[PDB]
Each structure stands twice: as structure tokens, then as C-alpha cells.
Enzyme design. Structure first.
Site, PDB file in Angstrom:
ATOM      1  N   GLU B 357       0.816  -1.065  -0.022  1.00  0.00           N
ATOM      2  CA  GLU B 357      -0.120   0.027   0.049  1.00  0.00           C
ATOM      3  C   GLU B 357       0.705   1.289  -0.004  1.00  0.00           C
ATOM      4  O   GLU B 357       0.512   2.177  -0.649  1.00  0.00           O
ATOM      5  CB  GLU B 357      -0.822   0.034   1.236  1.00  0.00           C
ATOM      6  CG  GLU B 357      -1.717  -1.318   1.195  1.00  0.00           C
ATOM      7  CD  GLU B 357      -2.474  -1.386  -0.162  1.00  0.00           C
ATOM      8  OE1 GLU B 357      -2.950  -0.425  -0.625  1.00  0.00           O
ATOM      9  OE2 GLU B 357      -2.436  -2.520  -0.377  1.00  0.00           O
ATOM     10  N   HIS B 360       1.821   1.833  -3.566  1.00  0.00           N
ATOM     11  CA  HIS B 360       0.843   2.702  -4.332  1.00  0.00           C
ATOM     12  C   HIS B 360       1.010   4.194  -3.823  1.00  0.00           C
ATOM     13  O   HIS B 360       0.789   4.982  -4.666  1.00  0.00           O
ATOM     14  CB  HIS B 360      -0.584   2.123  -3.752  1.00  0.00           C
ATOM     15  CG  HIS B 360      -0.871   0.941  -4.582  1.00  0.00           C
ATOM     16  ND1 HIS B 360      -1.451   0.849  -5.787  1.00  0.00           N
ATOM     17  CD2 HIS B 360      -0.676  -0.322  -4.279  1.00  0.00           C
ATOM     18  CE1 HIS B 360      -1.627  -0.363  -6.343  1.00  0.00           C
ATOM     19  NE2 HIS B 360      -1.224  -1.016  -5.463  1.00  0.00           N
ATOM     20  N   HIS B 487     -14.387 -10.998 -11.851  1.00  0.00           N
ATOM     21  CA  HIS B 487     -13.929  -9.910 -12.957  1.00  0.00           C
ATOM     22  C   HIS B 487     -14.760  -9.973 -14.289  1.00  0.00           C
ATOM     23  O   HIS B 487     -14.879  -8.849 -14.852  1.00  0.00           O
ATOM     24  CB  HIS B 487     -12.376 -10.293 -13.387  1.00  0.00           C
ATOM     25  CG  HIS B 487     -11.427  -9.870 -11.929  1.00  0.00           C
ATOM     26  ND1 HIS B 487     -11.647 -10.218 -10.791  1.00  0.00           N
ATOM     27  CD2 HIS B 487     -10.330  -9.017 -11.964  1.00  0.00           C
ATOM     28  CE1 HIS B 487     -10.636  -9.550  -9.920  1.00  0.00           C
ATOM     29  NE2 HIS B 487     -10.112  -8.703 -10.900  1.00  0.00           N
TER      30      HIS B 487
END
Lengths: 194, 595
Positions: B357, B360, B487
Site C-alpha cells: 500500500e 501505491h 472479474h
């Protein structure tokens, strides 16, 4: 003779925006620049043309104090010889400026929950201003060549756009209060001798 | 005045006016996520539809300036981004029913209720149990029951919709001057107008296939090993030469092979590295994990974390009086507002999730000096690649010894090395054939070389030539298994995972080559090497400003995705697999069946 009111400029209850910036004359007083210098409450304190330490032992003919509110990133555009929206269409310091620029953070004062949209700035214009000029005009700026007759539309925009100041923004997008002290020295009688 | 400057004025006003609406919608959705209540849902969708209406009016105003007169390429990129029409292309009824189809398919997949025949008064969902059954069971017939029941039911319930969903999306694609919806998905990798770096939308295919061959020699042998050990667990159904069945591989679909580490370990009597006990012994907490996280990035030569990060973010689950949804996310709210949402626990896995994270967040911090429309990765794989190559470095024994979690008397030998390479292989190399086959089939259904009457057929007639998994229950055209996956059911792209894997290992090889590391590549760590840090930053700050071909050529020395780093990372595993299979049957033939 008289200690002159830096308190009405620095600790004022209200400030004005950068398109309509407030200019106030300082005359016939004795100033104490040592109070301002090491107050350690100011984010930036940068003086062009005069050294910051020898300011008290000098006499001036006319001193001006201008005040406004800008963003965090834009404070670097308040300096001689820089470009950007603020330096082109809002506040132009000459290439020979003799004086000081002060800016400090005001997130405690100038920001609110839900945002604070009362500080405005002009984004478009037809030319760059020459030093120390103010434009308060609110006419509609056409970008192209087709008329729009005082009403917005395609290629016609309002020139002024409003800041949004939230308590949670980063350092760069936070309010900063700026005071620009402009000194001028010539062969007239004196007014401010510290 | 030329339309050159008119367009730039338009873009400048647009940026200065769009930042604010983005920020408000963002803070609204955040407050909804960190405190769930109908009032916050109200605030969220209100701010959201405001932002959407804004962008629609801005696009319908932006369509005017024609981009055959603009020579500056940044302006052309921004205007092309803003010009995209979107679902507003088609008629009113078509948009109505298409949005309804999307929402109802998502809802029906999320509300699947399957019920067993032995307890008709108790029926169960997919996400808690069904997943738990198929992940942690050791029974054959029960697993086949769960798998067949789920796929049959939801596939028959969903397929009639997806069927003409296909043609509606295809015409929505065609109107915007494209050959097929697959072209609209592939356009994310398109680049033209820069000589030496153009990349057609078809080239991607001719690349992704040309790589897959090189990946099969390593894969084939793995599929032998995973099969051989599995012969010991279910020695009444599997063939020495055939393919693996579907209900023996872990997850409901086989998207990963991570659930098989129990039945396929190389050397079982050797434990892996797990520092959960070492953390709870030294009384760590969330603050310590995230401090070490930021320390790793400060070492490489990247910024520190914002003060608002520490103030406003939520790094602990806030108790039982305040609810939340704590899927780990890294938030860019605009105006310099960067946060992280995570219900952290004191474990080993969160130690790496924090690095993912924060990677990111570092990407988002790097490209924040670009225009508004150019604030993203070079393509849809770069964020995940940059996030993963950080966990890859923080999960080595060297860095863990440096941090002081493991005592410096932890000696590693070729068994633990092979253990780590196998656990990595199951989840990295095993997801690639599935990904490639899935999106190849979608592309061929959209381009039309798979007529309806044959659809499902070639699906399995692909699974046996690429992945090597055969179906336990025979299915005709009345079934639809590919629509079951989350997905595919909810219109997301899927090649991002393939390209992510490849870019990931290319980045690792380049960095920990420039970082002065010799030896096996899976030991390389970029802690304390500013040289590699700047080489990464000179790719991060660009954003979508310039073609991804140059953004990659800056860092790897190459202009296309290549597999040599990946095959190099797994060579210590390849050498051992060749000898372990020196006697067993390698490969598979389609001539076998489980029924």
C-alpha cells in the site's frame, strides 16, 4: 517618536484576496524590525536588496505594506523575476525590488470544515502587469475571437476563480498570509527610522 | 487565435475547476467507508453524481476543438482523454437496459444462494463457506459437488444476459470507431505519434503469445510435480499422463495454486519463515509496522509520509461501536491528501501488505506534479508492479534479519530456498496460463471467431492445450462457467495481471542489477541504495505524460515486456524440477478424461 502599528497589518482580524490586495502607508514612526525577524512564527521571511540584520540602522522616505492570502505552492511566485498566474496577472514585483516578503501559515484561522471559499484570484488576462499594479476588473474574458456580449458561453469565461481551503489539505494547498514590505529611498525627508 | 491556445486555456480552466469537485466527492466517499450509515451513503452518491455531471458537461464542451491541428503532444493526450464519449454514445433505451444488465448481473453474483440436498433448511452463500469448503477440504466427491452445483446454477442463471450483453457492448465499442470491444480494452497500451515507440493495438497479442511459449518449459514441469504429489492424496481418480481435474486445486476457479502448499511441499519436515510470534513477543503494533514501512522507502531515497497521513488515516479497526469496510486501500483524495485504510492485525502478512500500500501511495506522491488528467500509471499494470516489487524485497531473510525480527543465527539452506521458490511459483507462474487463456477466449468471443453454438466447447478446448485442466462433469452449451468469475461478470479487464507479472520481474532485475547485487536474484534487496531509487523515481514522476514504452526503456533498457527476468528468477527451481522429474512423465495429453 511613535512606535507604529505593525499589529494592524500582521495581527489583523481580516485579510483581503490577491486580486484586490490591501496597501497601507507607514509614515512618521519608529519601527522595530527585530520583533519581526526572530519571531519564529513566520514560514518564510526573505528580503531582497537589504540585508535583514542591518535594517534598523537605515532611514526610509516611504514604506508600504501590502497584504493578501495565497496558496502554499504560490509563495515562490512572490519574488522578483518569476512566472506563473500570480506573478503575471495578480501581483508583480519589479526586477529591482527593494524590500521584504513574509508569509506564514494560517490553517488555524483561514480554513473551515466544509471549506472556505472567500479568497479569490484571477486566472486569465490579456497582458502581463508591470510592477505594482492592481486590476480589480470583473469583465468576461474571451479566449478566442467570437463575441459573447457580456454573457458567458463557449470560449468566454469568468476571469476570477475561488480558492477552496479545507482543514485536511496538504501543505502545498493550505492558506498562507503574505505581507510584502516595499521600501523606497530618495532625496526627500524621512518617515520611518527605526 | 489558433485553436492551439484556445484548447490550452480550456484545459487550464478545467483543471483548476475540477480539482475541487474531485476532493469533495473523495472526502465524502472516504467518510462513508470509515463509518457506514444511510446518511453517509446519501452524501456519497450525491457528491458522486455531481462529479459525474461535471465531467459529462466538460466532455460535451470539449468535443469541439478538433485534434488534427494540435502539435504539442501533452495537449493532444489530455484532449483525447477528455473527448471519450462513454456509454452516452448509444440511444436512451440501450443505455437504460445495458446499465440494468450490468447492475443485475453484479447483484445476482453477489447474492448467490446455493443449498445442499441433505439440509434444505440451511443454504449457504459463496464468500464465507463454499470458498472455505473448497479451500480447506480433503474430500473428493464433496468438493466436486460444491463446484458443480455453484457453476451449474449461477452459470445457467447468468448466461442469457451476458449473451446479448456481448453485442450491446460491441456496438458501444463500434460507434466509437473500433473493431471490437476487445480493441477498446487493448487501447490502453496504444501509442502513436512518437517515432520509434509506436505500439499498435494488435501488437500486444503478437507479443503476449510470443512470450507464453518461453514460459511453458518451466510451467510444464511444475504441472508434473503438482500432479505427482497429488496422486498420493486422491489415488483413485488421477492419471499418470492426463491433466488435473478442476476440483483439486484450491480456489473455486483455480485462479491461484496457493491452497496446495500442504499437499505439494518439497521438504515438509522443514518449517517456513513466519515472524508472527516474533512480533507478538516484542509487542509490536500498527504504528511500528507502518514506521518500518516508511523507513524502507526513506532508505531507497524517496519522500517521507505526509503529516495528514498520520493524523487522518485509520490504521486500526475502530471497535464495535463504529463499523467499517477494511479491505486495505491507499487513498489519493487530491490537494495533497494521501491516506491509508486498513484494519491491521499483528501478523506477518500485514507486514507485507503495508509495503504494497505504501508503494501505491509513493507512486501517487510522485506523479502529483502533472496535470489532472495525466495523473495515473503509464498503463494499467504499473501500480500493481511497483506495489509488488516492494513486498518482494521486504520478504527476504536479509531484510528481516536487518530489521531485528529474526535472530541473526537463522541459517538458510537449499531446502528452505526451494520451499520459498515453490510457494512463490504456485501463485505467480500458476496464474499466468489461466489469465492468458481467459482473455484470449474473451477476445475471440468479441472478435467473433467463436460462433455461439461452439462457445463453451472451445473454452475447455483451450483449458486442455494451455492450462491442462479437464472438466469433471460434461457441459453442453447450456452452461456458462467463464461468467462465474467476479472479474468477467462485472466488466473488468484482465490482461493487467499478465503484464503486471512480467513488468514486475523486469523491474526487479534492472533495479537489483544497478543496486550492486550478485548471486541468485531472489535474494536481492534494494534497502540502502539511492542509485536504484532515483532510477525508479525517473519513471514514477512521468505518469501518463509520455508513452509507456519510454517509461519502461528508462528503467529496464528495453522497449517491450520480456520474460528473461522471470525465467531467471525461477532457475534454482527449474534445476531441481528437472531432476525430480527425471523419471516421471512430463507434459499431458488431451486423450484422458476424469469421467
Amino acid at each position: 517618536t511613535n512606535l507604529c502599528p505593525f499589529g494592524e497589518v500582521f495581527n489583523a482580524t481580516t485579510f483581503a484576496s490577491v486580486y484586490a490586495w490591501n496597501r497601507k502607508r507607514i509614515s512618521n514612526c519608529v519601527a522595530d524590525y527585530s520583533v519581526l525577524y526572530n519571531s519564529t512564527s513566520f514560514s518564510t521571511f526573505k528580503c531582497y536588496g537589504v540585508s535583514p540584520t542591518k535594517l534598523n540602522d537605515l532611514c526610509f522616505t516611504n514604506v508600504y505594506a501590502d497584504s493578501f492570502v495565497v496558496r502554499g505552492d504560490e509563495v515562490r511566485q512572490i519574488a522578483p523575476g518569476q512566472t506563473g498566474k500570480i506573478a503575471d496577472y495578480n501581483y508583480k514585483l519589479p526586477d529591482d525590488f527593494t524590500g521584504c516578503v513574509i508569509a506564514w501559515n494560517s490553517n488555524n484561522l483561514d480554513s473551515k470544515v466544509g471549506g472556505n471559499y472567500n479568497y479569490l484570484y484571477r486566472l486569465f488576462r490579456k497582458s502581463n502587469l508591470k510592477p505594482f499594479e492592481r486590476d480589480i476588473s470583473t469583465e468576461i474574458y474571451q479566449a478566442g475571437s467570437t463575441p459573447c456580449n457580456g454573457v458567458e458561453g463557449f470560449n468566454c469565461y469568468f476571469p476570477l476563480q475561488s480558492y477552496g481551503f479545507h482543514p485536511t489539505n496538504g501543505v502545498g494547498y493550505q492558506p498562507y498570509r503574505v505581507v510584502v514590505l516595499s521600501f523606497e529611498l530618495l532625496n526627500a525627508p524621512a518617515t520611518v527610522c527605526g | 487565435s489558433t485553436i492551439e491556445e484556445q484548447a490550452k486555456t480550456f484545459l487550464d480552466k478545467f483543471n483548476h475547476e475540477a480539482e475541487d469537485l474531485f476532493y469533495q466527492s473523495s472526502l465524502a466517499s472516504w467518510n462513508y467507508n470509515t463509518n457506514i450509515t444511510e446518511e453517509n451513503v446519501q452524501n456519497m452518491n450525491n457528491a458522486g453524481d455531481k462529479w459525474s455531471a461535471f465531467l459529462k458537461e466538460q466532455s460535451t464542451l470539449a468535443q469541439m476543438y478538433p485534434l488534427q491541428e494540435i502539435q504539442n503532444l501533452t495537449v493532444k493526450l489530455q484532449l483525447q482523454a477528455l473527448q471519450q464519449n462513454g456509454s452516452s454514445v448509444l440511444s436512451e433505451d440501450k443505455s437504460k437496459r445495458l446499465n440494468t444488465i450490468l447492475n443485475t448481473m453484479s447483484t445476482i453474483y453477489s447474492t448467490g444462494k446455493v443449498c445442499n440436498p441433505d439440509n434444505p433448511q440451511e443454504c449457504l452463500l459463496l464468500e464465507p463457506g463454499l470458498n472455505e469448503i473448497m479451500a480447506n477440504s480433503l474430500d473428493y466427491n464433496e468438493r466436486l459437488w460444491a463446484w458443480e452445483s455453484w457453476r451449474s446454477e449461477v452459470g445457467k442463471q447468468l448466461r442469457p444476459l451476458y449473451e446479448e450483453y456481448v453485442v450491446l457492448k460491441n456496438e458501444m465499442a463500434r460507434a466509437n470507431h473500433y473493431e471490437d470491444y476487445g480493441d477498446y480494452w487493448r487501447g490502453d497500451y496504444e501509442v502513436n505519434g512518437v517515432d520509434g515507440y509506436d505500439y499498435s493495438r494488435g501488437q500486444l497479442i503478437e507479443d503476449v503469445e510470443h512470450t507464453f511459449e518461453e514460459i511453458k518449459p518451466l510451467y510444464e514441469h511444475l504441472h508434473a510435480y503438482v500432479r505427482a504429489k497429488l496422486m498420493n492424496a486422491y489415488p483413485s481418480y488421477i492419471s499418470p499422463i492426463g491433466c488435473l481435474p478442476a476440483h483439486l486445486l484450491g480456489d473455486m476457479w483455480g485462479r491461484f495454486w496457493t491452497n496446495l502448499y500442504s499437499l505439494t511441499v518439497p521438504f515438509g519436515q522443514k518449517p517456513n519463515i513466519d515472524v508472527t510470534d516474533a512480533m507478538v513477543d516484542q509487542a509490536w503494533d500498527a504504528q511500528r509496522i507502518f514506521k518500518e514501512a516508511e523507513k524502507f522507502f526513506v532508505s531507497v531515497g524517496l519522500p517521507n509520509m505526509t503529516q495528514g497521513f498520520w493524523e487522518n488515516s485509520m490504521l486500526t479497526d475502530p471497535g464495535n461501536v463504529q463499523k467499517a469496510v477494511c479491505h486495505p486501500t491507499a487513498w489519493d483524495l487530491g490537494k495533497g491528501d494521501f491516506r491509508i485504510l486498513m484494519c491491521t492485525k499483528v501478523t506477518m502478512d500485514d507486514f507485507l501488505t503495508a509495503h504494497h500500500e505504501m508503494g501505491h501511495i509513493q507512486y501517487d506522491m510522485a506523479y502529483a506534479a502533472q496535470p489532472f488528467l495525466l495523473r495515473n500509471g503509464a498503463n494499467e499494470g504499473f501500480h500493481e508492479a511497483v506495489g509488488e516489487i516492494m513486498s518482494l524485497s521486504a520478504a527476504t531473510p536479509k531484510h528481516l534479519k536487518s530489521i531485528g525480527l529474526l535472530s541473526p543465527d537463522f541459517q538458510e539452506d537449499n531446502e528452505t530456498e526451494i520451499n520459498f521458490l515453490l510457494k512463490q511459483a504456485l501463485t505467480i507462474v500458476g496464474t499466468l496460463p489461466f489469465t492468458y487463456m481467459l482473455e484470449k477466449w474473451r477476445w475471440m468471443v468479441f472478435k467473433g471467431e467463436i460462433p455461439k453454438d461452439q462457445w463453451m466447447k472451445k473454452w475447455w478446448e483451450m483449458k486442455r492445450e494451455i492450462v491442462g485442466v479437464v472438466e469433471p462433469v460434461p457441459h453442453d452449451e447450456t452452461y456458462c462457467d467463464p461468467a462465474s468469475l467476479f472479474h468477467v461478470s462485472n466488466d473488468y479487464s484482465f490482461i493487467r495481471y499478465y503484464t503486471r507479472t512480467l513488468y514486475q520481474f523486469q523491474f526487479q532485475e534492472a533495479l537489483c542489477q544497478a543496486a550492486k547485487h550478485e548471486g541468485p536474484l531472489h535474494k536481492c534487496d534494494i534497502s540502502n541504495s539511492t542509485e536504484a531509487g532515483q532510477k525508479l523515481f525517473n519513471m514514477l514522476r512521468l505518469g501518463k505524460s509520455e508513452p509507456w514504452t519510454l517509461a519502461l526503456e528508462n528503467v529496464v533498457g528495453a522497449k517491450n515486456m520480456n520474460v528473461r527476468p522471470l525465467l531467471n528468477y525461477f532457475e534454482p527451481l527449474f534445476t531441481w524440477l528437472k531432476d525430480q522429474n527425471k523419471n516421471s512423465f512430463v507434459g499431458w495429453s488431451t486423450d484422458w478424461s476424469p469421467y
